[PDB]
Amino acid sequence: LGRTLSRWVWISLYYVAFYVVMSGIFALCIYVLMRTIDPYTPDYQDQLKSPGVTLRPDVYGEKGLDISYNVSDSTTWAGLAHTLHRFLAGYSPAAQEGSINCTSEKYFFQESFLAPNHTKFSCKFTADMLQNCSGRPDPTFGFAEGKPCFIIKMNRIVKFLPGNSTAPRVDCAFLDQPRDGPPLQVEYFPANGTYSLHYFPYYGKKAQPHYSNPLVAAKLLNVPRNRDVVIVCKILAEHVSFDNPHDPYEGKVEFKLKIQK
Amino acid sequence: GMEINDHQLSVAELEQKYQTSATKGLSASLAAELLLRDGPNALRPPRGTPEYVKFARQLAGGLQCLMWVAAAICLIAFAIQASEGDLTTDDNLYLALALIAVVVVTGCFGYYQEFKSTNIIASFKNLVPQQATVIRDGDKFQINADQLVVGDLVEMKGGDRVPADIRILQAQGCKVDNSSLTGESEPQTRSPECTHESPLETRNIAFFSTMCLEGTAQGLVVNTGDRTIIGRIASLASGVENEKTPIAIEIEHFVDIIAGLAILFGATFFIVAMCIGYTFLRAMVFFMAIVVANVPEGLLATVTVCLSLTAKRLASKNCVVKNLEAVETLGSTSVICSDKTGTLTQNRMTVSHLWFDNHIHSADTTEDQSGQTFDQSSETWRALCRVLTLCNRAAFKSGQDAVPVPKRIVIGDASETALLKFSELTLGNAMGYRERFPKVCEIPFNSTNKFQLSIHTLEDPRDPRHVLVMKGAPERVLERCSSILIKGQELPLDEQWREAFQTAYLSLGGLGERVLGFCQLYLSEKDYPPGYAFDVEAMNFPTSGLCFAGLVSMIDPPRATVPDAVLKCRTAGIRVIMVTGDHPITAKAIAASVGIISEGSETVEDIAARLRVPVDQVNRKDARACVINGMQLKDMDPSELVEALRTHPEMVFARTSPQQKLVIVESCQRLGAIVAVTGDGVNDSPALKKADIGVAMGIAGSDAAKNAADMILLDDNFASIVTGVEQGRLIFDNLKKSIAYTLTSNIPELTPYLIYITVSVPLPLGCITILFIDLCTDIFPSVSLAYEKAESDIMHLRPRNPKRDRLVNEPLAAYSYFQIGAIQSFAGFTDYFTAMAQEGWFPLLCVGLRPQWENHHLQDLQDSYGQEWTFGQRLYQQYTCYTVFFISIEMCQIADVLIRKTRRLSAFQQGFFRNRILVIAIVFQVCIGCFLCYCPGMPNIFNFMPIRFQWWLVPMPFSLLIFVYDEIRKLGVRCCPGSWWDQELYY
């Protein structure tokens, strides 16, 4: 309505002054909040009792991962591979020069923070450990073959530990296609589909700047061609639980897979 | 046939028109056909009120059209969000139908509450079939009133309700009660002679609802049903369409404010939305999203419950209200236009003064016996009380020892029933005493002698002589007395007394009262021995030389609780105007008596009486009161009325028609007043309809007065109108208390969305939880405010100025959005930004993190530490950001309800616990919050999870900050009520 032109200034100055007094306490609250918070460890990590597990290559449709490709039509699978090549472009020996050969298999507790710029020590993981299915000797990860390779990868939680008993292994299996289909043949790389225990525990971007997650592949020989089938890849550890109905990726992956020819 | 021409026809002329006998009535066969042609002799009621259509209206109005418009926007947005395919659009469905639910459920609450209203009201009606004595084929017999047809021969007596519109043919002493149509409190004389051309002002017509008090007539039926003077008065009044209540207007100003912001708030953010870079469609969606965030879904319920509560507070006092908007109208009223007869007065002639023992005694004229009765200790009074008791033939109908004496119904004349309850109230058991003195002679009032007289054997047998007792017009008794009782002696009627009498008869004449003289004589036991055969035709006993007892005088007296009610209204700044169809003399009498015309104020017609200057030279500014009669008000205009109105503050309207009442109300309303008409009978229905709130009496009221009225007084206790101001003012305060509270919840509901689109942080607040706040957790607190005691002496305040003082004004809303709303949304963002950073997300990362955050195809997303979260995991974190932002709202809104307890006074001086409903609502508030979080499954049923107990307390520093900020603006507005602070920080 703009009744009193000059007194706006006073009420403008007032709101202006009012808001600035009010924005201050907010600033001075994150400022104190920022320094309540540890740069190393999550205060609560409340929503992560079990970790998530993703898969490559990731191709969704309506209602989740549906991977459908054609051995003969090199169009249907070239982009699934370039997904795997450029993903491992960060697992190359050259671009992982910042970490170290890890021999001690059972765990890794870096109590002392020893590496340049108050860093800590990250383990090496290069493409080689998925032997049949890196970029070389087969650039198409068994896709042109029709026995494709999928790599599985656990989400990291600072100071999360998956158990003492053994190595947590990926287990991928046919789901409800046994009537005439023999059970799924899968060769995992490294063998038995194991995750080596000396990548635990995770310490975070500040502690481990060049950290990289361990991988297991699954080369599926058995898969019937030109048949819609689903495949589930579950992880096995005592401190790991894979079935939450609100979160389907809590310890596993499902994917529709149709390999056409 | 027509109105003008029935009283002006000869018997030959009428009986030709209706093919009837003036002496032998209709035939039976024809009277039955006329009924087929004209239908019942009653009023066709207000026809057409379909039960499903009573319900529809409860869905329209200021808030409802807003809410519906909002629900529309929800669905257009939900659709546009399906073209550009969106998931979790269940929100827009959940949102729009929650809006369309509130509107609807309030319509039911309103409908059931008006249902309850009408049944309670039609529980107090009179449903007995009134009757007629008709003559047909030459048989006098009785029928129902309603079976009367035009042109019929009818008879009335004392006690008969006039069954139709009748044209008198012959009449014997027939006086009638017109107070329903006119204001006239004194019986009107009814004769067969055409008194006047206006059928209302003639005497040879009887009106379809009136009461024949005394006498007899025969006459012809000339109108029936809706075609009668009463039929016409209400068909007029229905024609009158009534304006919108002040409360209803206020609510709609409040909507022109809400939307006015929602549009201006929405449009700038949309224009900002385009520049951050957004498909026009999405920018125009967020425009939508936020105009709907400006609308409060729940407040249309809290308003309504608030009103119903004060509705019940009244009906507990027998004050029944037909709609809820009427619970406010009295508070905001400034002019009362009030009827005299039946509303201000009892419309019942009671004995009021008495000249005896050389003194004017004033009686008690109250129905509950609360006044000051007179001196009943004299031999003169005992004698006078004997004569007035013994010379009276009226009689209480049987079985009324329960009902109060004024309420008891008597067979007998006007003047005689007043004397009967008078004897019965003071002497006690009047008819019994009367029997102990057997009547041996009696003459009823005729013009042949112009008095009534009866001779009696006394009570003990040791007194074998007789008492003659006589009463009539005072002069006609004076010419027949030679003796006056005075002070235990029986003195001679010298000239001193023939002048004392005259000055008393006239002193009681100018008050507008009917005055009667009483007298007696003790006939000797020798001349008149037990058994003496008295004779009227040949006077064998004295009719002169009698002993004068005294004068008794009666008036139509105020209702007991009325003068105090007028005094309580006027002290509260309301103007009172009298509007009566009665003659100015008695009109001004009662207006003085009750408080319309203050003790010691004059008309120009009174100045000229003592100033002895012609009324023309008398000055107009000097006269405070003014009586304008109906004739005089005709030759005036809307300009000579307003100058009369704003000159004379104590205005009185005599001889005013049903329409002139409408006119007065209109001038006032057109001068910007909220008027209240307070009426009984049909002469008030029009006025009662045009009125901002029309108030009819529940017992003396007629059906048209009741039907036009918004509010009914079932005890007929005019003092309900005083408590109806204070209730109607309080809840108008308790509304801006309650709305100011519910408005500040919109800005901490909106900013998270405004931020969530403007800088793309993960969504901090979901509108399933906004629904929970607006409709589940904050309702009870907002209705608590309905129970706030006044913060001042409300009933000594002027009525609110409708132009300056609005329910919701710009400073009140701006105060809530921009200063209280601003501080709440800050207590969300912190508690949100910590819950993020505590769980892993640093604030500067939460910037622009939304696109990846909400992504279903990124199962692995890493936080500021670098842990990789999946979608449903950070969904749970976002749901937590909901539940954290939600209990940041409630912790302020405990500090918000306490602050909106009191607009000006410190909650320290008032108290934190005065309001007991408010405490129970805050314990209710903080219990739902707990149940929503820690009950199992709430994370999936709704968006509510078990919250870290550190996060409850994060906001509380902000709740106290609010308390202290309004406190210091409430402490600095009362201690320092200057100019700067009074306007900018106040509501």
Ligand SMILES: Cc1nc2c3c(ccn2c1C)[C@@H](O)[C@H](O)[C@H](c1ccccc1)N3
């Ligand atoms: C104040 C507020 N509004 C919303 C909101 C959503 C989520 C949270 N919201 C909050 C906290 C979405 O479901 C929708 O975009 C929704 C919407 C509603 C009407 C018109 C257009 C969009 N608006």
Ligand SMILES: *[C@@H]1O[C@H](CO)[C@@H](O)[C@H](O)[C@H]1NC(C)=O
């Ligand atoms: C891992 O092996 C040696 C240690 O035995 C290490 O120095 C070297 O960097 C790694 N091997 C190669 C081929 O680089």
Ligand SMILES: *[C@@H]1O[C@H](CO)[C@@H](O)[C@H](O)[C@H]1NC(C)=O
């Ligand atoms: C992996 O490759 C080696 C040699 O290239 C071969 O012996 C082995 O059978 C391969 N695995 C599968 C599953 O074919």
Ligand SMILES: *[C@@H]1O[C@H](CO)[C@@H](O)[C@H](O)[C@H]1NC(C)=O
């Ligand atoms: C796979 O691709 C080849 C080459 O385009 C095509 O001819 C063949 O029919 C495809 N198979 C199916 C099942 O569509």
Ligand SMILES: [Mg+2]
């Ligand atoms: Mg009246």
Ligand SMILES: [Rb+]
């Ligand atoms: Rb809202």
Ligand SMILES: [Rb+]
């Ligand atoms: Rb008295």
Ligand SMILES: [Rb+]
């Ligand atoms: Rb009305």
